[PDB]
C-alpha cells in the first residue's frame, strides 16, 4: 500500500526508523547545492505522539517537527519557517516529502526523496521526477545525492 500524510488511511507509525536522503529538489537550486543550508542527509525519523524527531547530518543535527492544525502537515523552524507534508510513501522503500520554506518575507519549495536503503531504483527516482514536475520543479533542479 501507498499513502499520503494528508490521506485518510495514513499510518504515521510506519514511517518510523531508518531513512536516507536520496534526491533533493528545489525551485531555488542554491538551497540544495554544495553550500546550501538544505543539503541535509537524513538518518532517521522518530515518530512521537504529536511530533517527528528528525536526525540529519550535513555535523549532527536534530530537529523537532510539530503537527499543525491540518492532518499530515508538520512545521519546523530551520533557516526560516518550514511546513511540510508527505505526498507519497510506501513505508518500506521510499518517502517523498514536499516542503515550503518562508524566510525574510520570501518563499521556496523543496522536495525530498528518502529511501530505507542508501539508494532507490531508477523506477522510483522517475516517479519522484514526475512528482517534482507536478509542482513546477524542472529536472535540472533535481539533484541525486546517492553518490555524495
Swiss-Prot record:
Abundant in the urine of adult male mice but absent from that of females. GO terms for biological process: aerobic respiration; cellular response to lipid; energy reserve metabolic process; glucose homeostasis; heat generation; locomotor rhythm; mitochondrion organization; negative regulation of DNA-templated transcription. Keywords: Disulfide bond, Pheromone-binding, Secreted, Signal, Transport. One of its GO terms (molecular function) is pheromone binding. It is found in: Secreted. GO terms for cellular component: cytosol; extracellular space; nucleus. InterPro entries: Calycin (IPR012674), Lipocalin (IPR002345), Lipocalin_CS (IPR022272), Lipocln_cytosolic_FA-bd_dom (IPR000566), Maj_urinary (IPR002971). Belongs to the calycin superfamily. Lipocalin family. Binds pheromones that are released from drying urine of males. These pheromones affect the sexual behavior of females. This is Major urinary protein 2.
Amino acid at each position: 500500500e501507498e499513502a499520503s500524510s494528508t490521506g485518510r488511511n495514513f499510518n504515521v507509525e510506519k514511517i518510523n526508523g531508518e531513512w536516507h536522503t536520496i534526491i533533493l529538489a528545489s525551485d531555488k537550486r542554491e538551497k540544495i547545492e554544495d553550500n546550501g543550508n538544505f543539503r541535509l542527509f537524513l538518518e532517521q525519523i522518530h515518530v512521537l505522539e504529536k511530533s517527528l524527531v528528525l536526525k540529519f547530518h550535513g555535523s549532527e543535527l536534530s530537529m523537532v517537527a510539530d503537527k499543525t492544525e491540518k492532518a499530515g502537515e508538520y512545521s519546523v523552524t530551520y533557516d526560516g519557517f518550514n511546513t511540510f507534508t508527505i505526498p507519497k510513501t510506501d513505508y518500506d522503500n521510499f518517502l517523498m516529502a514536499h516542503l515550503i520554506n518562508e524566510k525574510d518575507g520570501e518563499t521556496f519549495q523543496l522536495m525530498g526523496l528518502y529511501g530505507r536503503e542508501p539508494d532507490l531504483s531508477s523506477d522510483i527516482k522517475e516517479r519522484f521526477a514526475q512528482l517534482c514536475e507536478e509542482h513546477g520543479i524542472l529536472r535540472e533542479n533535481i539533484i541525486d545525492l546517492s553518490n555524495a
